[PDB]
Amino acid sequence: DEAAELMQQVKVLKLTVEDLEKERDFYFGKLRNIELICQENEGENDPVLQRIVDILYATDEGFVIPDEGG
Amino acid sequence: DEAAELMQQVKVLKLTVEDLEKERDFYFGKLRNIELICQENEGENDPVLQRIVDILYATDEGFVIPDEGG
């Protein structure tokens, strides 16, 4: 049935959403603590902190960076 | 209409899915490079690397850790 697929879709999407945003939220909360940790230990800017800032700043074209202008 | 909401749901869920998994994927790919970077610089296990491993290992109850048993 038409709506049977549609409602099953929201099932799969609910599931994908719950799988997705559960990790998106958890992973992102983790990311918030790494950024300020870089400024907590910039001072001693060891290689890891040079390659993980590269990590944090892994932006590319098509991707949005906030506070763009410096 | 019944299916009109349902198909609009998959719209919103598609949108949420695309917003979600685009970040879930991007953020997680970033996370893959931090974990091995910790073992790249464990040797010199500075505070950052003690607090970001806490980050990477921010697990709790209800959350699954792979390779559980050591």
């Binding site: 950024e35 300020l36 | 991007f26």
Partner: peptide, 11 residues
């Protein structure tokens, strides 16, 4: 914390 890390715009 300093909102410079890549995002989407979204909302």
């Amino acid at each position: 914390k300093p909102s410079k890390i890549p995002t989407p715009q979204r909302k």
